[PDB]
Amino acid sequence: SQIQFTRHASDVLLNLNRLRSRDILTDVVIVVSREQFRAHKTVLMACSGLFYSIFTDQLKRNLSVINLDPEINPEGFNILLDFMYTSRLNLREGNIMAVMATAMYLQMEHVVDTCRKFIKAS
Amino acid sequence: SQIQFTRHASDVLLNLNRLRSRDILTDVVIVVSREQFRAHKTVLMACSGLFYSIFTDQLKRNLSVINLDPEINPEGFNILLDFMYTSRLNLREGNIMAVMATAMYLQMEHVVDTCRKFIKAS
Ligand SMILES: O=C(Cn1ccc2c(=O)[nH]c(N3CCOCC3)nc21)Nc1ccncc1Cl
Numbered sequence: 001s002q003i004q005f006t007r008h009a010s011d012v013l014l015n016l017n018r019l020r021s022r023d024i025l026t027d028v029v030i031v032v033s034r035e036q037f038r039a040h041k042t043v044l045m046a047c048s049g050l051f052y053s054i055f056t057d058q059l060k061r062n063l064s065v066i067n068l069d070p071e072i073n074p075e076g077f078n079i080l081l082d083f084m085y086t087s088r089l090n091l092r093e094g095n096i097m098a099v100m101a102t103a104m105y106l107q108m109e110h111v112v113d114t115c116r117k118f119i120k121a122s
Numbered sequence: 123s124q125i126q127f128t129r130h131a132s133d134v135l136l137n138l139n140r141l142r143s144r145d146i147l148t149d150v151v152i153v154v155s156r157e158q159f160r161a162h163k164t165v166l167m168a169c170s171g172l173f174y175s176i177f178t179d180q181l182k183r184n185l186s187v188i189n190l191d192p193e194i195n196p197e198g199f200n201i202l203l204d205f206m207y208t209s210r211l212n213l214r215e216g217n218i219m220a221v222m223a224t225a226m227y228l229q230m231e232h233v234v235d236t237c238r239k240f241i242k243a244s
Pocket residue numbers: 045046047048049050052053107108109110137138140141
């Protein structure tokens with residue numbers, strides 16, 4: 001019965017990404033080997049089982065730095081972080097295995113499923 | 123060239139609303155006369171000119187309480203806050219004028235335009 005605004009969610013996500021690009025109200029640094037990426041915990045939680053599980057725990061909720069597994073490919077992580085904030089996933093033959101393994105680690109099941117479909121179509 | 127996830131933005135917004143409902147990582151209380159509403163500043167900024175302008179200013183960015191104009195109808199505000207987190211706007215004959223005036227105050231231009239269309243269709 002409510003009026004539906006079809007573009008609203010995408011508009012919100014766009015603006016959250018704009019805030020990320022200006023480092024406004026970002027509240028965590030994700031360290032992946034020699035690279036670091038800032039983000040909003042709320043978005044990470046919305047998009048990742050790993051981050052949801054980390055930040056829902058009152059023991060870790062207030063952490064401002066998260067060190068990921070050193071084995072994680074920083075580029076794979078970056079691709080997934082960008083996907084979180086844009087809805088667009090950059091899969092290529094050169095990055096498919098790194099992105100897929102990283103998505104497994106981040107517990108992003110729908111993305112893992114999409115990587116499986118990409119492999120199947122390759 | 124990137125794979126588009128058509129439901130992703132709405133999924134993110136849904137999960138942000140779930141976090142709001144559990145008061146997880148909310149960082150501001152919006153006081154509207156005798157009522158109060160918690161939220162995430164990032165979402166408020168994404169959806170409102172007023173909140174964008176308030177929290178982008180380094181003078182006010184860290185405020186944890188915002189007192190709105192006492193004249194603002196709390197129900198009108200609540201309807202708009204729910205819209206921010208859901209994409210669904212509950213317009214009715216009983217609330218149209220309060221919602222519209224509140225949307226003007228919050229500088230939510232697309233919503234104001236929609237209220238004008240509602241008035242025109244009434
Ligand atoms: O749902 C997510 C995050 N999210 C996105 C994809 C995805 C996924 O594929 N799996 C998991 N989990 C969770 C932890 O346990 C194992 C599986 N979470 C995922 N956030 C969430 C859920 C409920 N209210 C608020 C929030 Cl923010």
